[PDB]
């Protein structure tokens with residue numbers, strides 16, 4: 001089972017982690033097969049070669065944090081490395097649902113896509129709801145005085161702190177908790193790579209939590225959002241005959257009474273039962289004329305392996 005490994009950033013000093021991060025930045029996500037790159041790709045590596053690359057300091061940092069395991073004559077990693085838009089991010093390997101631990105962290109299914117979708121504005125205070133590996137938070141930290149990442153998965157919170165230290169980022173905070181419970185006051189930016197996919201209304205697990213998690217999210221948005229604030233959400237939406245997602249959403253948001261401008265970009269569509277239709281898209285609340293707008297944009301087909 002994958003996603004249960006111990007993650008302990010507190011067991012390594014910040015300077016060492018930062019320097020590991022700097023070594024990752026050079027080799028992770030490129031074509032050079034260094035020990036480090038191999039390690040964070042799922043390939044076992046020779047510790048003496050790893051030591052050549054990142055030093056005994058680096059080698060010990062990999063082990064003490066849980067990034068690598070000493071299997072005797074080789075090291076392996078439970079984690080996989082990524083380098084996105086200047087940021088290095090470790091997460092779990094992408095594996096089928098049936099072998100995921102309950103504390104499995106989103107292996108960056110959509111994150112590289114989402115960052116390209118995200119508005120390139122900055123501001124005071126950002127919130128990354130369901131931060132998982134921390135990836136969206138790490139990106140937002142460049143632009144915001146302060147970023148708060150929230151997850152109900154304690155392993156995600158630890159992984160987030162690890163990844164922030166690897167990148168030397170210190171204006172980010174990560175908190176374990178349930179949706180908005182640990183998020184006090186208001187935010188100028190809220191990002192939500194929602195745990196919704198094929199489960200419809202049913203709660204399945206942390207990565208497919210059901211439509212009610214969106215209702216909870218959107219019902220609270222008006223009181224968590226600063227004036228002129230921006231909300232961005234990746235989500236699956238179910239339309240049923242006589243019951244479109246957009247109208248339930250409008251009700252949750254109190255869309256008209258709150259003067260929110262909503263724009264939905266629908267990328268993928270699927271047939272579902274009850275004559276329903278499933279869609280995946282990118283939802284943006286941004287300052288502008290009250291109302292909801294939906295447009296077609298097959299950005300999965302277009303980008304996926306691109307910008």
Ligand SMILES: N[C@@H]1[C@@H](O)[C@@H](O[C@@H]2[C@@H](O)[C@H](O[C@H]3O[C@H](CO)[C@@H](O)[C@H](O)[C@H]3N)[C@@H](N)C[C@H]2N)OC[C@H]1O
Pocket residue numbers: 094095096097106109110193194195196197206207208234
């Ligand atoms: N935030 C995410 C959202 O981005 C989305 O992610 C999807 C991802 O889970 C799916 O992953 C499935 O297929 C993979 C093989 O391809 C299998 O290893 C996987 O365990 C399985 N799950 C992807 N194929 C498509 C993604 N959009 O739904 C889950 C939410 O928690």
Ligand SMILES: Nc1ncnc2c1ncn2[C@@H]1O[C@H](CSCC[C@H](N)C(=O)O)[C@@H](O)[C@H]1O
Pocket residue numbers: 105106108109111129130131132133134135136150151152153156177178179193194195206207209
């Ligand atoms: N009730 C809840 N409160 C806070 N986070 C939750 C939650 N239920 C599920 N989540 C989290 O929502 C995340 C969805 S996957 C998104 C992970 C990350 N932000 C990324 O883009 O890669 C998971 O990390 C899951 O643990």
Ligand SMILES: [Mg+2]
Pocket residue numbers: 097100204205207208
């Ligand atoms: Mg699952």
